[PDB]
Design a protein around this ligand. Structure first.
Ligand SMILES: C[C@](O)(COc1ccc(Cl)c(F)c1)C(=O)Nc1ccc(C#N)c(C(F)(F)F)c1
Length: 247
């Protein structure tokens, strides 16, 4: 199980937001903590991504672009999983020190998105997603959004994405001699992975609007995040960069 050994081995550990939970909730503080948390997780997403099998094959510019585009979705997916395993989807486990109840979902002004992620969290349970299916599905997510104009080395990207799909097939076939059983599972999983995109889109849109009026709501946007939101996110919202759906 070389491939899964690698995925387990590089899976980021716990990342805290540094939020002050002794302070009454507020939009400004919850959002600054979400911004800071997002940035902290990005540090790990980059280290994770670069240690992924075959990733280094991608052109240097493609590696960075793909990480930045996939950044939101990857966080959404892992957060839903953490929410499921830690609190049985009762709340959204953004981080040990940043857990959202409905009140916080409402106060963050990201209520519709949070509810959608809570449903995703429940999906992990309802579909009985295994830790290994999760790990492989997450790696696949990193290769699920590309520019219409194409990457520097599109062929390398396609090969890599195809190999990751092949690994998902193997994890699914492992202990399923019934083809019909494998097919239904692949259907369920690709359906779950597609559901992540629309959620990341609503968060992208929300964050973009927020950045534009950040000075009007007292939100502190970190350096790297502001740059990525103003350079990369606009490409997604305008349709120049699109997610790869299965269905
Ligand atoms: C608003 C924000 O602070 C920043 O989100 C962005 C992150 C990346 C990009 Cl490309 C963006 F446009 C916004 C945020 O959503 N942070 C955030 C931090 C951690 C997690 C986790 N886990 C999440 C997520 F994915 F659950 F929604 C979100």
């Amino acid at each position: 199980p070389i491939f899964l050994n690698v995925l387990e081995a590089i899976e980021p550990g716990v990342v805290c937001a540094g939020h002050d939970n002794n302070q009454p909730d507020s939009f400004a503080a919850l959002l600054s903590s979400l911004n800071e948390l997002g940035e902290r997780q990005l540090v790990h997403v980059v280290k994770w991504a670069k240690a992924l099998p075959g990733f280094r094959n991608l052109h240097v510019d493609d590696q960075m672009a793909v990480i930045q585009y996939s950044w939101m979705g990857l966080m959404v997916f892992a957060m839903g999983w953490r929410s499921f395993t830690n609190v049985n989807s009762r709340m959204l486990y953004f981080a040990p020190d940043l857990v959202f109840n409905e009140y916080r979902m409402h106060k963050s002004r990201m209520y519709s998105q949070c509810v959608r992620m809570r449903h995703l969290s429940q999906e992990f349970g309802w579909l009985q997603i295994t830790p290994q299916e999760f790990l492989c599905m997450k790696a696949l997510l990193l290769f699920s959004i590309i520019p219409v104009d194409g990457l520097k080395n599109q062929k390398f990207f396609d090969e890599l994405r195809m190999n990751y799909i092949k690994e998902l097939d193997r994890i699914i076939a492992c202990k399923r001699k019934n083809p019909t059983s494998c097919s239904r599972r692949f259907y369920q999983l690709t359906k779950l992975l597609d559901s992540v995109q629309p959620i990341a889109r609503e968060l992208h849109q929300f964050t973009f609007d927020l950045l534009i009026k950040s000075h009007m709501v007292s939100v502190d946007f970190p350096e790297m995040m502001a740059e990525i939101i103003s350079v990369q996110v606009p490409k997604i919202l305008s349709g120049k960069v699109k997610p790869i759906y299965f269905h």
